[PDB]
Amino acid sequence: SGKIDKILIVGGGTAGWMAASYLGKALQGTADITLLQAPDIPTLGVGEATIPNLQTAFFDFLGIPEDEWMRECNASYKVAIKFINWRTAGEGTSEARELDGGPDHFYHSFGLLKYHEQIPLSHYWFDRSYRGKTVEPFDYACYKEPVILDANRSPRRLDGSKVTNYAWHFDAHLVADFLRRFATEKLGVRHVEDRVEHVQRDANGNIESVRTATGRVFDADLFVDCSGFRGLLINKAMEEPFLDMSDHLLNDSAVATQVPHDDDANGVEPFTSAIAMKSGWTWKIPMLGRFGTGYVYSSRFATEDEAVREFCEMWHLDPETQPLNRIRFRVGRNRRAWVGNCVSIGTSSCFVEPLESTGIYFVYAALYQLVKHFPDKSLNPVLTARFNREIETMFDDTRDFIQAHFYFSPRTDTPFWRANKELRLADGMQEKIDMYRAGMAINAPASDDAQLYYGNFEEEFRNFWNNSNYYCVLAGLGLVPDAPSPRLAHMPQATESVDEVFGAVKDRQRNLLETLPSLHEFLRQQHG
Amino acid sequence: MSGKIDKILIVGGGTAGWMAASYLGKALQGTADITLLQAPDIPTLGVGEATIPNLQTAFFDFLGIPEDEWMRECNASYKVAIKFINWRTAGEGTSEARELDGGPDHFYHSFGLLKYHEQIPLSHYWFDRSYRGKTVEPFDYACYKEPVILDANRSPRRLDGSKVTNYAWHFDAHLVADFLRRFATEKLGVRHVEDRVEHVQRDANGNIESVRTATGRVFDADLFVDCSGFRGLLINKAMEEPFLDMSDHLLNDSAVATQVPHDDDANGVEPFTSAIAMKSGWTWKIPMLGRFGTGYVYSSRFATEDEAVREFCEMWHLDPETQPLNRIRFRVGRNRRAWVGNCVSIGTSSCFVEPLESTGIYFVYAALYQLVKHFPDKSLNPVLTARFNREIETMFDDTRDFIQAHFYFSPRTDTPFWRANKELRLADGMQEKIDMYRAGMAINAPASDDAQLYYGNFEEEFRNFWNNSNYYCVLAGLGLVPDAPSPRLAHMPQATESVDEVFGAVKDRQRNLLETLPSLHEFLRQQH
Ligand SMILES: N[C@@H](Cc1c[nH]c2cc(Br)ccc12)C(=O)O
Numbered sequence A: 001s002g003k004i005d006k007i008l009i010v011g012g013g014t015a016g017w018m019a020a021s022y023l024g025k026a027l028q029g030t031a032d033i034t035l036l037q038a039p040d041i042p043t044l045g046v047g048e049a050t051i052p053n054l055q056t057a058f059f060d061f062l063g064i065p066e067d068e069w070m071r072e073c074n075a076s077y078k079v080a081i082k083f084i085n086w087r088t089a090g091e092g093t094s095e096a097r098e099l100d101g102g103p104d105h106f107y108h109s110f111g112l113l114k115y116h117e118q119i120p121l122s123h124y125w126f127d128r129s130y131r132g133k134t135v136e137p138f139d140y141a142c143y144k145e146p147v148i149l150d151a152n153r154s155p156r157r158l159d160g161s162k163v164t165n166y167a168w169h170f171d172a173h174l175v176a177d178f179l180r181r182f183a184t185e186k187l188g189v190r191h192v193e194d195r196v197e198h199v200q201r202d203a204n205g206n207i208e209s210v211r212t213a214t215g216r217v218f219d220a221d222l223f224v225d226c227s228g229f230r231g232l233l234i235n236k237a238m239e240e241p242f243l244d245m246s247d248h249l250l251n252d253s254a255v256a257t258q259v260p261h262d263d264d265a266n267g268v269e270p271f272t273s274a275i276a277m278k279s280g281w282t283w284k285i286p287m288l289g290r291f292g293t294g295y296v297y298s299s300r301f302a303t304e305d306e307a308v309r310e311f312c313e314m315w316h317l318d319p320e321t322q323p324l325n326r327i328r329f330r331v332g333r334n335r336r337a338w339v340g341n342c343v344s345i346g347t348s349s350c351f352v353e354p355l356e357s358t359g360i361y362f363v364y365a366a367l368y369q370l371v372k373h374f375p376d377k378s379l380n381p382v383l384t385a386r387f388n389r390e391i392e393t394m395f396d397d398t399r400d401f402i403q404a405h406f407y408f409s410p411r412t413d414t415p416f417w418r419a420n421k422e423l424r425l426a427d428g429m430q431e432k433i434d435m436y437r438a439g440m441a442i443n444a445p446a447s448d449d450a451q452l453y454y455g456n457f458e459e460e461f462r463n464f465w466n467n468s469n470y471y472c473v474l475a476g477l478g479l480v481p482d483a484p485s486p487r488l489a490h491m492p493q494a495t496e497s498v499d500e501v502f503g504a505v506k507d508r509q510r511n512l513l514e515t516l517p518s519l520h521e522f523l524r525q526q527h528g
Numbered sequence B: 001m002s003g004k005i006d007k008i009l010i011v012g013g014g015t016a017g018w019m020a021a022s023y024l025g026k027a028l029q030g031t032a033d034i035t036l037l038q039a040p041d042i043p044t045l046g047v048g049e050a051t052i053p054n055l056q057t058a059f060f061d062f063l064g065i066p067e068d069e070w071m072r073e074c075n076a077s078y079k080v081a082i083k084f085i086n087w088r089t090a091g092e093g094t095s096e097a098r099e100l101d102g103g104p105d106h107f108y109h110s111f112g113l114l115k116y117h118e119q120i121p122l123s124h125y126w127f128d129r130s131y132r133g134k135t136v137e138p139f140d141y142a143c144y145k146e147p148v149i150l151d152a153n154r155s156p157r158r159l160d161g162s163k164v165t166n167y168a169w170h171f172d173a174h175l176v177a178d179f180l181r182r183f184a185t186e187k188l189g190v191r192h193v194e195d196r197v198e199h200v201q202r203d204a205n206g207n208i209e210s211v212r213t214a215t216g217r218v219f220d221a222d223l224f225v226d227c228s229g230f231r232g233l234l235i236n237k238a239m240e241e242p243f244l245d246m247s248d249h250l251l252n253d254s255a256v257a258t259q260v261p262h263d264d265d266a267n268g269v270e271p272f273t274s275a276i277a278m279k280s281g282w283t284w285k286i287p288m289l290g291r292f293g294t295g296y297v298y299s300s301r302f303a304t305e306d307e308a309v310r311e312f313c314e315m316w317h318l319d320p321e322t323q324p325l326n327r328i329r330f331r332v333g334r335n336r337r338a339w340v341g342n343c344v345s346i347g348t349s350s351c352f353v354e355p356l357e358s359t360g361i362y363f364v365y366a367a368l369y370q371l372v373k374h375f376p377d378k379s380l381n382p383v384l385t386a387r388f389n390r391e392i393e394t395m396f397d398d399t400r401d402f403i404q405a406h407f408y409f410s411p412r413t414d415t416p417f418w419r420a421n422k423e424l425r426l427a428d429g430m431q432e433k434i435d436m437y438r439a440g441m442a443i444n445a446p447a448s449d450d451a452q453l454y455y456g457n458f459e460e461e462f463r464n465f466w467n468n469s470n471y472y473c474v475l476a477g478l479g480l481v482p483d484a485p486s487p488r489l490a491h492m493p494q495a496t497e498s499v500d501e502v503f504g505a506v507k508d509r510q511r512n513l514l515e516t517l518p519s520l521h522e523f524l525r526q527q528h
């Protein structure tokens, strides 16, 4: 019995120093935290994309203003994800192909669809599209962002006022160093540069101590595994099985690099690009003077040399001189994220391809659930079981959503895209698609107030993947309901007054397009 | 078998029938012909109905009926909480609270949400002090301001009309049914037919084709709404849908009720419903204007009808040979599926549970809200029916589990009834909630402590109907408390110290409202 006195974090990556900062802040003055980190071969900064709650749920919790960490991490702004060439056959190219008299792209923006007479705007859009009253795509009809993103507009005016929900693009290595300084200098976290040599467990299977290569022994009451894919504690020591979920996600490898960019000549894109490839997809994360890019592919349909060739040719890079990072990740999650006195945080717990910018979210979302379910020395099993339940739902819901990107793509030109259609959706995901086809919303938000959504982590965590996200991806790829929502035929006044709702989006599209500065213009004044 | 619903037939009148006619008539105004089949039954006494705050915001506001309009026409009173009397002390069934720890054996279940302090509900701070001997005040008096003003029969609104707390209403159901009958027929164009169902004609698909009445009239429709009560003329008799008896969780199955005249000038009016524990059940008291309704809900396995009538009459000093009494034998449980084919069951034809927590009328307009949200066309898409049945199934089962906890966790052991309740088993969903509760966790904590958002957004409340505030009121009120304080509080020394001002604010509101609020009788006099 007694409270947790000492906490040992194994691993000093991005997740490791987020755990040290979050736990150091949450338990300030009531727990001694030590982080074990061994020097590894450093890698390139291939870029990271995030979601709006990174500020409200993480940096706000630490008490760090957005401007403070943005300037020290050379971060850019992210307004949406631009899905390129997901509906047209062809090689992997950065240029959008032609589809129905226009470029093959669609946006997944932040925020929530507006409610009109208790019904999301998506249902009103499809009702018009189904009956031939409109041909405008879903994203351009219901969101104001696509128009200003086509012109690389900034999410904030020169006076600082924000006109849309946005996230950030940055190099994870810089944020890790920023949080390393914050945790050690402000929160009293102890940093130890050593390599784990032996993990000693007791008769109950719990971790007793960790011995390093130099002979130092570190004991604690609670151990946090941030060692990445290796899982030194949760997998190696605790012997907890890892659940491979490649029966839903075929991608398991990646080739990534960083490419210099002339922001003065071309501006900066306020969005992440997800460019469909022949055996996967390639991300593009614009930053300051450069952009990170990585080809996520499936080793079952493309060899590493084929992926390196495809990746370099699309960006006009020299495969013999370009610095490249070749990665082979494990897709899935542990059977239990928390076992005994060992809590897994980061890629040691779970991993999925960064198609929807969930990597960093998984860290501080798990850290949020860890503090909410924080135990004492008795390690109450109810706290551990409920934490493991939240983590498995957080990941499995994301896994199902990511699979829908490939499962519902109309492409059939390569074995990769054809095989994705041969996989089976999870029962929870298949039920969601059944609702969608019936004209229902999928996890409709309780309110269309984005400030409440992104300002209340509990409100968002219970409704992380909401109707707005599903319609952006499903309707963007071409999946639409079999027929309009049957209740709209009983709402003649609602379907008539909705004209002003679509007109309001058109007016904001025109006004913001004409008045907003470019992202490059704002970044220049922002970053000095 | 396509096209929108054109004709809707409601079988059964009363409260459920005319609530369905009003809600569906308003939602589908001008796009559906609605006919209500009602046969004259032997009328019963007005034994009183208790409600919850969303009755105005989710039902009457949807109809466009101001609170003052329907209150005056139904002679309604105000309800601020439920006072549970004699649930922790042994003895006969009496209206007088017994002595417990130097005070009356009662505790309140109030409306609203517990205030958050540093992201933690106030209940966790209360028990932390109680566990460490820092306080002896009961949970309800420490965290709620209502118990103090309810002990003095204070009004929930000042004489100037300003409301000082969340409240509901007390009324005779028959008056509300007549009010809605006039509203639906005169304002919404609903057709009322006085006839008795003679034969229900089904087709080869199992769907209802038409209904023939005793006079030979045949009524056909596209969608049928069963509001026939416990008889289940359509859902059970015609559709042959099985009814799931749940007497393994709730032993009460009978009731003896009446109405008692009351001199409001001499004794005032109680702004709360009373739940008076009995030897083989419990007795309600629903104060109204010049009278109060009362009913002894009991278990036929432990008390005969004559024993319950005697217990009921003796506690109110009534003549068992002359007092007008209503003897009822209800079915406890729910249908296997609330909606089958083109037949949707609404009201007690769908499910029933004892009115211990004032959920009877709520079940009607909550189901009507889910019916419109899942409204079908002539094709009757099975996904709409399946999702509706799931929402109804969760709505009742969660209520069933909560109601059982009232008896399961009562410390009384003096009668075979109370002893047998401890021999039943809680549902797995309820047992897991109790496991969390004992572990110091909240049970379905609200996303926000803003009651206006909660009671103003039916979707927000429906997803969190039984929240942490409700569970703590009943469980801690009966004496069930966690095994130890939340381990997370030991790491928040500043939070556990600054919470002193939160409890002091409740004490200041208790003192100020007690001195300035008028009595309910005083406010009712000026209003009515
Ligand atoms: N609730 C999350 C859901 C989400 C996860 N990844 C996203 C990426 C984009 Br682009 C838009 C939304 C999300 C949000 O609205 O930010």
Ligand SMILES: N[C@@H](Cc1c[nH]c2cc(Br)ccc12)C(=O)O
Pocket: B052, B053, B054, B080, B081, B082, B109, B110, B111, B112, B357, B358, B359, B461, B464, B465, B466, B467, B470
């Ligand atoms: N969310 C519901 C829960 C509830 C159902 N019946 C109740 C009865 C009382 Br008294 C208080 C709360 C409830 C409310 O607070 O109105």
